[PDB]
Design a protein around this ligand. Sequence first.
Ligand SMILES: Nc1ccc2c(NC3CC3)nc(-c3ccccc3)nc2c1
Ligand SMILES: Nc1ccc2c(NC3CC3)nc(-c3ccccc3)nc2c1
Length: 334
Amino acid sequence: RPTFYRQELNKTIWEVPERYQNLSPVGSYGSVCAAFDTKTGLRVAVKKLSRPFQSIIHAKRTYRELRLLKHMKHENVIGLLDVFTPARSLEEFNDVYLVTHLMGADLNNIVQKLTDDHVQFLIYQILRGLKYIHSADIIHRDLKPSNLAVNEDCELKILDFGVATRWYRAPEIMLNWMHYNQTVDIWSVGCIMAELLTGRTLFPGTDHIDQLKLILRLVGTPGAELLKKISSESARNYIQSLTQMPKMNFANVFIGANPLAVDLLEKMLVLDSDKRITAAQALAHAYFAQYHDPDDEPVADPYDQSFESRDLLIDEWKSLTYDEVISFVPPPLD
Ligand SMILES: Nc1ccc2c(NC3CC3)nc(-c3ccccc3)nc2c1
Ligand SMILES: Nc1ccc2c(NC3CC3)nc(-c3ccccc3)nc2c1
């Protein structure tokens, strides 16, 4: 066990290993401090979870967050440098702190007027991380510029938790489809890419009804092939009742963009999610010609999501979390 030290940071009592020095609050789910990690000489983010075990729901979320972070080992996905608690046993375990690399800024923070070459590289790395995430049978579901961290070097990582979420949300989620799949995240990337190319939010809906309206304006109203797959009578009838909007020609919307970027946008922003390009397929698209390497786009180890279907007591989730803190193995130095 390391020596721990205590301090007050903007209302909170932080108790951290001596390893982490010069804590400096950066934002407040829980709050975050920048720190110097004396073990590596790198700046790190230390996140103290707020009330991690205060309900069955908080408790399972805490476990979920730790399981996910522990799993991610990819250059374009946030990973866990450390997890620790000041507690010496399960019985006094009440606090969890998570340590990750400190990233420069978020993609929202860097959006003024982006060059096509920057767009290629940034979207490439998003798709590379998503390939990896999706290969674990995980759906991010909340991809938006504030959940993407970027270095000054333009290196990007997808974050679990860092502008309205809805603006980036696939139409099938707004419509409450229970069986939406991983291409919801490709929809989101499409929305992000469009925004990077034009400097404007592609769909700034004021709410979900407005959001779908703006969406169908561009992608047009569902064809016969999509309608016959919609299990909800009310939703199909609603969809079918709207004024028929033809799909816009994207060349006439993203005027002057690289035609390859326009073409990839066409394959991402397909209304029918069964026809949307996957992350793995997007990577091989011609737009990423100067970056794509089929031998350096790895997939993830399988991830056991079976706890998701379990209903456990608070102390059991809390105990499973403690087990995960105890079994944590630091990533290799350098
Ligand atoms: N195989 C599929 C493909 C796309 C689907 C989709 N897409 C949303 C219209 C854009 N929506 C729905 C659905 C089902 C119940 C209630 C509301 C929506 N199902 C879909 C099934
Ligand atoms: N007359 C109707 C009948 C059904 C509807 C429905 N059905 C989905 C199963 C919930 N969803 C929506 C809607 C519209 C915009 C954004 C999100 C959802 N509108 C409906 C309007």
